[PDB]
Design a binder for this molecule. Structure first.
Ligand SMILES: O=C(O)c1ccc(Cl)cc1
Ligand SMILES: O=C(O)c1ccc(Cl)cc1
Lengths: 504, 504
């Protein structure tokens, strides 16, 4: 295998004096040889404080040069970084660090997060990020340390994933998973080795795409990673010109902003250097996509993946954000929902997407054997996504199994109804849920938020739906117009709490 | 890891009804699902005849659909194919099959080769290729067989390499080596996954490039491999148009022919679909390269590699065939000649190119522990090539360590002098060797073959050399004009026998 550290170490030998990491707003520039030395120093400093291999260290920080240095330093040492979204609630972050028996936690949030975990009964050395490294410049003591032996199945990094239940599950990513979690950006997306590679880091480092597909890939290809502490669409496009960005990987939301900005700021900004615009577009509306083809340069590549298996499907120059086909490393099936992994659907029926659990796959959820059992079955990973095989021989992602509504025999996907109702005039936000019914089985219900100052009516929305493409059985039976939808801290609809709020 | 079989098996699930293998002259077309079934049938047939995993089977055949089927069948079974050049002498092929204690040998050469090995005292079941599979159509009996467990360090394939000594050494290629032996065609050369991939198979299957970089890559990327039984330049260009070839990998000699043909047959042939023209150009003269840029389409990529480690250096759009830089998977050093692996040269001095021995590296030479010891040292593979670091921070390949001449302090590379003298009028072939001298140390000597009917003189060639770029000390001290140069069967100059022939 080739580990993260080993990928970066090799790169460092090939391109020691080439720009590795840049914060152009902060004026910070680090070469491959320079970054490595800082990684080596922070590692040996963390080791001098008694940190050992296989020990789990939580990392809670927004994107920065220093957090990259820290995460890679922790990895070079032998420790296992557990990367956590800083936008999570203080109590949630504290519980997950307790849950995971972490040795220490590297933090660059407020003092309230530090207090919360300090008084949670955890046993985790609070390490402030600025104590370890600040503005690329590390605080370092002790001699150069040893590079420990790494085994393929051995834990390397921990990333968190939002299950149906409650608290995020901690997916353990083995050493051998790094290569294919990087190289799909080459085989699917078309990146190649070379110092031409300039990669805009719009994706958070706590997410696997942000880490493997963007940071590590950028470095492993002997290119440069452009740090972004905070996203702003016109600023991001300026960095594209100013830094000669070759590829960007971003969410549907960023790309909506970025393409709209690429309209207001037209041929003022030169975006020619950008050759790859990549995204997870399963939940990207057809309008945003159309906007992206019209107004943004470079090859557009839609990417389907999960924290647990990384990349499973893709599409070059996509006409629709839902339909994709498996690429290199991947093997996929669609099976009857709730059935065994060998129960392939009638090739027109709907079922759960499962993907082979090989090199890139996680080795389980930390301290959650039951959840692991529901997800890793007989060499397959269960996505929990509903899909169908199309006439063109491709896979169309319909929605999540837990979000699926069934109203009297016919399966119904709220994401479809949400896209239609979201185009209705005066609608700013819509979630469709199924209320319990003992006649239809489940009654499809729309919960709709009006635009500022506007009023909606159940009648007008029904009339709108009746004009749309929706088959009769899919039309909502009931509407609730709401001031707001209850959402967690980060930052999605609670389809359990809403259903309860809809009753009493 | 991801083995050859496992790469091809996965591809088969992703693109079962897509064209996998084509012999357009013979009208033969095989899809991924179809090829796999034939691979499965020939495997189970070979197993029904008592062949077991880890058993070594020699394969001696020119390129064909059937030999691809056979090699992959043998691999799917668990056996270890030992791929041997059919142009080798009967006695040499027989000795190497004895040397390697092969269980059986799959042959599609004359009866003389079959007789030779039959009466060599080997113990190897002579299997004619047409007994196993003919025109894609297999001869099959027995039930479907088991897929055996494969370990990373375990032997998978054996390829032969021409050492300095005599008989070709048998390099053992481990299971874990296949991925990076394929994926460098993505990271360095820029191939991506997709059914657009149409790959012209001009490289012999007995060579690692021909096998991993061309055949396996073509299939593993869900593309098509275009079989060629016999190379002809105008015919090869026709297949480029007719089959919409996206990439070709070929020798300097093919590319000389192909580009010259691309002149005589001009805009008659559409070569637009061709996007990658790849080659090992270390020994490609500057004229052929110039010709290749002027007259052939697609991105030109120079590739340096060895049977033992696969890809170690490369160059996009090369201006010179000698200068290259390491890509993904690779780590390289230049060390003092004959010294330890940690003896880096003064970054302007000449030394031996060594490359890190990692995943892609061979695990030794079969039944040759001494040779293995000279080549795998402390985690590095010794190329036996002399190189220097250039001002631009790249590696310039100068020539082979065994071919190096030293004439009174100054190191001299016969390949340089050969390129100059090869441009001299009336020269059809030139080899420069160093004769033993106890005053200069070694005396540089040119052995030169005149063009048909032409006469050369030592004086005229000396005058030509004196007009050229050659520094005074590099000029040959003596000339031997010869009717022919003694060459082995396949098909290179014997720098030991010539030196002897030059004396008495
Ligand atoms: O979590 C995701 O959405 C995700 C994870 C991995 C990939 Cl490659 C793409 C998307
Ligand atoms: O043997 C060779 O010349 C050779 C082997 C491997 C590569 Cl990638 C390139 C060239």
């Amino acid at each position: 295998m080739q580990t993260v550290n080993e990928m970066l170490r090799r790169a460092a030998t090939r391109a020691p004096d080439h720009c590795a990491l840049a914060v152009p707003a902060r004026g910070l520039r680090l070469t491959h040889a320079e970054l490595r030395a800082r990684v080596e120093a922070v590692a040996a400093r963390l080791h001098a404080d008694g940190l050992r291999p296989q020990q789990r260290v939580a990392v809670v920080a927004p994107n920065s040069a220093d957090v990259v240095i820290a995460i890679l330093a922790l990895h070079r040492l032998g420790a296992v970084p557990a990367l956590l979204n800083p936008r999570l609630k203080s109590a949630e972050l504290a519980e997950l660090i307790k849950r995971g028996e972490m040795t220490a936690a590297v933090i660059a949030v407020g003092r309230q997060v530090a207090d919360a975990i300090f008084q949670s009964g955890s046993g985790a050395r609070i390490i402030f990020l600025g104590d370890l490294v600040r503005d690329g410049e590390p605080y370092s003591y002790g001699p150069p340390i040893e590079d420990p032996q790494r085994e393929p199945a051995q834990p390397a990094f921990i990333f968190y994933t939002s299950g149906t239940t409650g608290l995020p599950k901690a997916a353990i990513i083995p050493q051998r998973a790094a290569e294919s979690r990087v190289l799909f950006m080459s085989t699917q997306v078309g990146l190649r080795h070379g110092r031409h590679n300039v990669v805009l880091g719009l994706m958070p480092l706590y997410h696997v795409v942000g880490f493997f597909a963007v940071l590590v890939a950028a470095l492993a290809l002997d290119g440069t990673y452009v740090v972004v502490e905070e996203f702003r669409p016109v600023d991001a496009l300026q960095l594209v010109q100013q830094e000669q960005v070759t590829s960007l990987f971003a969410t549907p939301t960023h790309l909506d902003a970025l393409a709209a900005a690429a309209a207001h700021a037209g041929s003022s900004l030169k975006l020619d250097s950008l050759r790859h615009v990549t995204f997870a577009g399963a939940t990207m509306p057809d309008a945003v996509l159309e906007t992206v083809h019209q107004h943004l340069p470079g090859e557009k590549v839609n990417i389907y993946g999960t924290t647990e298996a990384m990349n499973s499907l893709y599409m070059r120059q996509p006409k629709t954000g839902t339909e994709m086909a498996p690429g290199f490393f991947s093997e996929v099936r669609i099976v009857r929902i709730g059935g065994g992994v060998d129960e392939i659907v009638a090739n027109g029926e709907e079922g759960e997407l499962i993907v082979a659990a090989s090199d890139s796959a996680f080795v389980g959820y930390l301290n959650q054997p039951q959840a692991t059992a529901e997800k890793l079955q007989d060499g397959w990973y269960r996505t929990s996504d509903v899909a169908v095989w199309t006439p063109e021989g491709t896979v169309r992602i319909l929605g999540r199994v837990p979000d699926m509504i069934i109203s009297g025999g016919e399966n119904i996907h709220p994401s479809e109804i949400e896209r239609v109702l979201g185009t209705a005039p005066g609608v700013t936000e819509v979630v469709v849920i199924g209320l319990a019914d003992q006649r239809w089985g489940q009654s499809v219900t729309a919960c709709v938020v009006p635009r500022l100052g506007e009023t909606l009516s159940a009648d007008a929305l029904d009339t709108f739906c009746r004009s749309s493409e929706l088959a009769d059985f899919k039309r909502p039976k009931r509407y609730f117009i709401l001031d707001q939808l209850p959402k967690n801290a980060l930052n999605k609809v609670l389809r359990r709490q809403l259903v309860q709020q809809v009753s009493s």
